[PDB]
């Protein structure tokens, strides 16, 4: 019985591979050779954030690209004003080991989570102006690795138990459960229309899920090691995945195949955080060599190098308008990088 | 300066002084990571340190020794895959790794886990405190004689008791030889790599002895001192 099912699964995998080969006629790099190269890119540190006590684990930008939220292992969640460097709020965290944080699109709530397996959401617009624990979400049997808001009452969270959950803030209970991963889910990326989200797990796999329906749509296994970061293309028809194999891979939802591979001989360390620009022309990926690399999304060439972090870069975020890029590192310093003419 | 800007500046100053107070509290408190197998007596040690005082995910215990606060963190509910979240503990003061010395069959698993955590990329600069727990059970098992470590570890046949050993006066020499064989087996793995940036502190724990926490205290003190000796390049 089991052998027959395994043989059928192998035959279906072979059929899928044959279909992928048939639908693949030309490489992406072959047709992008006629475009003008981006060239060398140099970015300067416009702002530096200081005040955290431990390593920065994750950060998220606001809708207005003015206030950002930073999470550190010291048990403090700090809101930073990117313009005047002034601190807006310093929320004490009951669990010091926080691995992810999220900022609501409306800016009224902020979420965090980590090894405690509890998603804590605080309201930033209280009547008396004092931050308090608005909601606590429980039910995950693993460390919370990434959380992203969908609206003022719904949130999507991912944990290490190979399971993703959809939480309603008003009720506090799970409404949709996504299962199918074999390794720990590291990060997820929301589509611009908030209809689909693709999440990568620690099995060299990335799966696309529908929030409203609640089942997997496409599965991509082009990587060789655990995928740590994932970002969504602005058009919503593609995404990029970074893994420990020192290689970024671009996948297309409609093509159901990898588009381009970003790797070099001089880089051999893992990839922690990846993100796209406003137009998606450049892919910024932070590595374990204490810096980040900006690659050309089309020609697969190292467009630029962002160095100046004393430790590994843990989180990388790009503003909605693309004004600047915020990179957090384990040295307890968050640096804002931007280009100039 | 605008009135709203001045209000923002004064609020930022209040946040800064709150963060300074939090930093002063944080620097005076040390953090420890507890690791061990399910059959190990980690729960007994946690219970003892909690009672003496001197879904859930992670458990935190606070205990004060010699007017020094220590926060010990234990894994409450996590999967068997520990290759990712362990990186969260790259800045802890010490890692207490408890090993059950009574289970010879699972001793190889403990050795493999110790080697994996010792050679981790993000745990290179973190010292590990080794507790060879269940000493009484190991002594009883050795005295029984039904099972011998030679079958599990052939190297025990050629092993010899170290000259610098300090056995208990009323302890059988065979038990001392076995426990020091286990200790040297751990020490060879610990010294195989590391280059002296981090150190191991193998201690024999009875899972009921009160000194254990104090031992950790002393160990942590040494670590801090060694850290200072690494600031002046004295080691």
């Amino acid at each position: 019985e089991l052998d027959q099912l395994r043989q059928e699964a192998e035959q279906l995998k072979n059929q899928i591979r044959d279909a992928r080969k048939a639908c693949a006629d030309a490489t992406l790099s072959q047709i992008t050779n006629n475009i003008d190269p981006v060239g060398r890119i140099q970015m300067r540190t416009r702002r530096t954030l200081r005040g955290h006590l431990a390593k920065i684990y994750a950060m998220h930008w606001g809708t207005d690209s003015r206030l950002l939220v930073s999470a550190s292992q010291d048990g403090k969640l700090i809101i930073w004003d990117s313009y005047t460097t002034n601190k807006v709020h310093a929320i004490p965290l009951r669990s010091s080991w926080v691995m992810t944080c999220a900022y609501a699109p409306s800016g009224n709530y902020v979420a965090c989570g980590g090894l405690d397996n509890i998603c804590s959401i605080y309201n930033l617009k209280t009547r008396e102006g004092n931050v308090r624990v608005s909601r606590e979400l429980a039910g995950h049997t693993g460390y919370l690795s990434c959380c992203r808001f969908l609206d003022d009452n719904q949130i999507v969270t991912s944990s290490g138990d190979t399971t993703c959950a959809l939480w309603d803030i008003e009720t506090g209970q799970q409404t949709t459960t996504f299962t199918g991963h074999t390794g720990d889910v590291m990060s997820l990326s929301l589509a611009p229309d908030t209809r689909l989200f693709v999440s990568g797990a620690c099995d060299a796999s990335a799966k696309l899920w529908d929030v409203r329906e609640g089942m997997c749509r496409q599965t991509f296994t082009g990587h060789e090691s655990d995928i740590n970061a994932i970002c969504f293309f602005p058009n919503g028809n593609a995404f990029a995945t970074g893994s420990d194999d020192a290689t970024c891979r671009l996948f297309d939802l409609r093509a159901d195949q990898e588009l381009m591979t970003y790797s070099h001989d001089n880089i051999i360390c893992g990839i922690t955080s990846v993100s796209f620009s406003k137009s998606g022309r450049l892919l910024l990926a932070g590595y374990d060599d204490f810096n980040c690399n900006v690659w050309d999304a089309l020609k697969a060439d190292r467009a630029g190098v962002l160095a100046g972090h004393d430790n590994r870069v843990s989180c990388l975020g790009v503003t909605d308008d693309g004004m600047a890029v915020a990179t957090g590192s384990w040295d307890s310093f968050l640096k804002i990088w931007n280009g100039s003419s | 300066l605008s009135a709203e800007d001045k209000a923002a500046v004064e609020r930022s100053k209040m946040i800064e002084k709150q963060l300074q107070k939090d930093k002063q509290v944080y620097r005076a408190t040390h953090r420890l990571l507890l690791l061990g197998a399910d059959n190990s007596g980690k729960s007994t040690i946690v219970k003892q340190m909690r009672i003496y005082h001197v879904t859930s995910g992670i458990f935190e215990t606070k205990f004060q020794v010699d007017k020094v606060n220590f926060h010990m963190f234990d894994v409450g509910a996590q999967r068997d895959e520990r290759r990712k979240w362990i990186q969260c503990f790259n800045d802890v003061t010490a890692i207490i790794f408890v090993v059950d010395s009574s289970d010879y069959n699972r001793l190889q698993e403990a050795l493999n886990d110790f080697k994996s955590i010792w050679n981790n990329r993000w745990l290179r600069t973190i010292s590990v405190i080794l507790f060879l727990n269940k000493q009484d059970l190991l002594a009883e098992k050795v005295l029984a004689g039904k099972s011998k470590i030679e079958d599990y570890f052939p190297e025990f046949a050629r092993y010899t008791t170290p000259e610098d050993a300090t056995p208990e006066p009323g302890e059988d020499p065979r038990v001392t030889r076995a426990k020091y064989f286990i200790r040297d087996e751990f020490l060879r793995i610990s010294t195989a790599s590391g280059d002296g940036r981090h150190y191991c502190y193998p201690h024999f724990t009875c899972s009921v002895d009160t000194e254990n926490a104090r031992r950790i205290f002393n160990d942590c003190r040494d670590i801090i001192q060694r850290m200072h000796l690494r600031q002046y390049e004295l080691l």
Partner: nanobody
Amino acid sequence: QVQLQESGGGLVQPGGSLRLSCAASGFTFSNYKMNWVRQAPGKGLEWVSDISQSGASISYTGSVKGRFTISRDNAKNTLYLQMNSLKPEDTAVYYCARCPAPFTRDCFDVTSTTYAYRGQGTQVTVSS
């Protein structure tokens, strides 16, 4: 897709010789460290032996030390395991596991029961 296929096994008389082969595809074999795991009936996964990228550092567990030999061939992209002087206690299913990360000296979740970077394994029964 990263996959590993194991060949060799079955019924073997005690004290005989056996050859286990593993073919891995979907990744660079020369980059990752290789491990062998065994699952006995009624017992959990236990580490057996490991070989590094270049084969300079090869280690075995104390149970089968001096009895099993593990080698790799990068040109043919394969792994070989020669077993001699088998015992009835060695009746188990063999899995070939890959290091989770490249260019690293530590294996963390190789013995994990839910590890994904391993093959299906083959059954070896040492019976008379």
